Amino acid sequence: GSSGSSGDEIFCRVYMPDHSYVTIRSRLSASVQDILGSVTEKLQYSEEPAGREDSLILVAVSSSGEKVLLQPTEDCVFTALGINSHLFACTRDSYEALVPLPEEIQVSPGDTEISGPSSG
């Protein structure tokens, strides 16, 4: 038997439009669809890979508002995504409703950014 050797697996996080991401374990060779399916599972719907959905599209949002509608036919996502970037999975009419996460010393992708005493 064996567990692994190198281990490239990572934990993708799909930031919600209401500010509430999840922790999903994915590989560095997955796809938007793959993740979606995974995240979708995290979403309160059911114990299935398809707990009823109304078309969910991924989108990369950075600390600025730079949205980049991704595709289900991607290759290197986890990598493509910069540092201060967050993935958002929502409908097409919600894509805009999407908002870029803040910039604090809290739950974030970058972390240890030590912005400064600049509240606002």
- DSSP characters over 72-107: TT-S-HHHHS-SSEEEEEE-TTTTTT------SSSS
Contact 85, 75 (CB under 8 A): no
Architecture per CATH, 9-93:
Roll (3.10)
Among 28, 35, 84, residue whose Cα is nearest residue 56:
35
List the one residue out of 37, 17, 68 whose CA is nearest residue 25. Answer: 37
- Per the entry, the structure determination technique was NMR
Domain boundaries, the chain: 9-93
- Residues 92 and 55 sit within 8 Å (Cβ to Cβ): yes
